Design a protein around this nucleic acid. Structure first.
Ligand SMILES: C#Cc1ccc(C#Cc2cn([C@H]3CC[C@@H](COP(=O)(O)OP(=O)(O)OP(=O)(O)O)O3)c(=O)nc2N)cc1
Ligand SMILES: [Ca+2]
Ligand SMILES: [Mg+2]
Ligand SMILES: [Mg+2]
Ligand SMILES: [Mg+2]
Length: 539
DNA sequence: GACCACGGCGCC
DNA sequence: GGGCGCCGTGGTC
């Protein structure tokens, strides 16, 4: 390409190099742009950023987040990564996409700009004719990238002092558990080392080994195994409590306060748009989609996520989302009728499980039923189910027979989906997002059946994901107009931040936008909560 | 230091 | 059953 002075003309593709992957923390090392056979290199990247009207190129959202951090309103535009991910969601990295669609991902900004330009041309070509994928790109993925940039740059407030204090408390409890374990083992060892623990449990205390690990065939010390052995020796429950506390301390309590940004005073995650096989987003550095909520200590951590003073959090959650999506995709009259009547399958299964009418099913019972309903729907074996519910095998095989007896068109949909997957090589969501599943015709049963369960799950999980992304795209401009902010997405949950005086109005509006995002054969229902912290806002 | 595989486990 | 990302260990370079 011909070397030309900065700045580039409008519509140019950008290339950039960062000192590290996280754009909120990165130094912008180099910046360049490519258009019309020319490459333009920025003499000073930060100042040069002000010359761009949009970020158009590979990883555009990352550059946009960095620009927002610097107080510039530079939105992301076209990004070849999003095109490639739509063609085939195994396209997740710039390295892989480059090699596959016509270049090499290097560490030089000018080369990255030229690459962005060539790849976009190539991928745009592959998408011609693909009307549904083009719709997803134009109506969902491309504008969602702008919404995600704002969310990343905004971050979320965390009560640092509270977490520091909590760390000290938890450390003391860990010491008490550790001391007791060692006493019961008759010697100290590294309780964090599963290899060392395996030897104490199975070789020294002589407990029965229940299971083996996948890759290396060691005797497993997983929670499922320890639960099975909690009556066999008092050390086992102490180990389970130790695991719970150290997992929470090492993963959340200790790292989180160190990730507060000096400029914002907030915690900033990355929302990865081309990371999953199904079209869900992921969250990383730190992952904020797996913040604890189950246990008492988990709930105390969830309370550390708070609104700015004078604001409130608003938490929105689609109810029974995958079952509702399944009803639409399958067209099963019975399942459809369940939701038109206002019924709850989780509650109804929890009635069966715990032996309760339908009334007085506490929230905890309902949640236990979730794993059962999802597990069974997606192909959990009758043996795992019998083991989970502590019931005879024949009662489990019967339970699954009844599950699919109640909604006969679900099986037919599953069969239909698997056949198209075998014939075409991919399966699709309601909106045409695809996932290629080559192992559907594998001659090894375990491999083939694993592929089947991935294949028929994808349209359900991915349709739910598409619906939430669409909702986020629709909701974002409405929030801006009300001075509210979108903070986090957790798959089928959204967390917003609103001025206290407008939080009620924000919640009502957000609920309506999410419920009416794309009408299905059954109503979408959204539960909404308001509070000073994440836990309080989820009621 | 960084990277890796693994087992294990947090949430959806 | 499906989908993720991060931890510490043990190991390497
Ligand atoms: C305690 C506890 C506890 C906490 C979490 C779970 C859990 C869980 C799982 C979730 N998923 C997928 C499908 C539905 C979507 C949104 O997960 P979720 O909101 O919980 O499902 P829902 O919308 O039907 O439940 P509702 O909002 O009405 O209370 O995420 C899944 O495939 N497998 C799971 N095990 C089970 C128990
Ligand atoms: Ca939900
Ligand atoms: Mg939820
Ligand atoms: Mg792994
Ligand atoms: Mg080490």
């Amino acid at each position: 390409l011909e070397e030309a002075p900065w700045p580039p003309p409008e519509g140019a593709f950008v290339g950039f190099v960062l000192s590290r992957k996280e754009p909120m923390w990165a130094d912008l090392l180099a910046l360049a742009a490519a258009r019309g056979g020319r490459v333009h290199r920025a003499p000073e990247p930060y100042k040069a950023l002000r010359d761009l009207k949009e970020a158009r190129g590979l990883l555009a959202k990352d550059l946009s987040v960095l620009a927002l951090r610097e107080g510039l309103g530079l939105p992301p535009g076209d990004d070849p990564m999003l095109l490639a991910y739509l063609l085939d969601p195994s396209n997740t990295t710039p390295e892989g996409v480059a090699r596959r669609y016509g270049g090499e991902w290097t560490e030089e900004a000018g080369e990255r700009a030229a690459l962005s330009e060539r790849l976009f041309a190539n991928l745009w070509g592959r998408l011609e004719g693909e009307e549904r994928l083009l719709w997803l790109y134009r109506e969902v993925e491309r504008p969602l990238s702008a919404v995600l940039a704002h969310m990343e740059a905004t971050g979320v407030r965390l009560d640092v002092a509270y977490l520091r204090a909590l760390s000290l408390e938890v450390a003391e409890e860990i010491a008490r558990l550790e001391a007791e374990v060692f006493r019961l083992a008759g010697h100290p060892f590294n309780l964090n080392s599963r290899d060392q623990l395996e030897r104490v449990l199975f070789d020294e205390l002589g407990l029965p080994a229940i299971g083996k690990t996948e890759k290396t065939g060691k005797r497993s010390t997983s929670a499922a195994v320890l639960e099975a052995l909690r009556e066999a020796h008092p050390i086992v429950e102490k180990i389970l409590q130790y695991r719970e506390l150290t997992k929470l301390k090492s993963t959340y309590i200790d790292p989180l306060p160190d990730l507060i940004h000096p400029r914002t005073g907030r915690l900033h995650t990355r929302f990865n748009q081309t990371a999953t096989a199904t079209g869900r987003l992921s969250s990383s550095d730190p992952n904020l989609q797996n913040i604890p909520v189950r246990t008492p200590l988990g709930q105390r951590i969830r309370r550390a996520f708070i609104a700015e003073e004078g604001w409130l959090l608003v938490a929105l959650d689609y109810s029974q989302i995958e079952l509702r999506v399944l009803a639409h995709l399958s067209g099963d009259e019975n399942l459809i009728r369940v939701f038109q009547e206002g019924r709850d399958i989780h509650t109804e299964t929890a009635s069966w499980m715990f032996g309760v009418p339908r009334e007085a099913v506490d929230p905890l019972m309902r949640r236990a039923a979730k794993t059962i309903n999802f597990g069974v729907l997606y192909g959990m074996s009758a043996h795992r189910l019998s083991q989970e519910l502590a019931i005879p095998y024949e009662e489990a095989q019967a339970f699954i027979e009844r599950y699919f007896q109640s909604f006969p068109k679900v099986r037919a949909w599953i069969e239909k989906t698997l056949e198209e997957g075998r014939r075409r090589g991919y399966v699709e969501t309601l909106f045409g997002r695809r996932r290629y599943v080559p192992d559907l015709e594998a001659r090894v049963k375990s491999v083939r059946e694993a592929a089947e369960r991935m294949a028929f799950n994808m349209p359900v999980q991915g349709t739910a994901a598409d619906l939430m992304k669409l909702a986020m795209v629709k909701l974002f401009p409405r929030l801006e107009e009300m001075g509210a902010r979108m903070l986090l997405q957790v798959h089928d949950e959204l967390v917003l931040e609103a001025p206290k005086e407008r939080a009620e109005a924000v919640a009502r509006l957000a609920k309506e936008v999410m419920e009416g995002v794309y009408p299905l054969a059954v109503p979408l229902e959204v539960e909404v909560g308001i509070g000073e912290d994440w836990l309080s806002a989820k009621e």
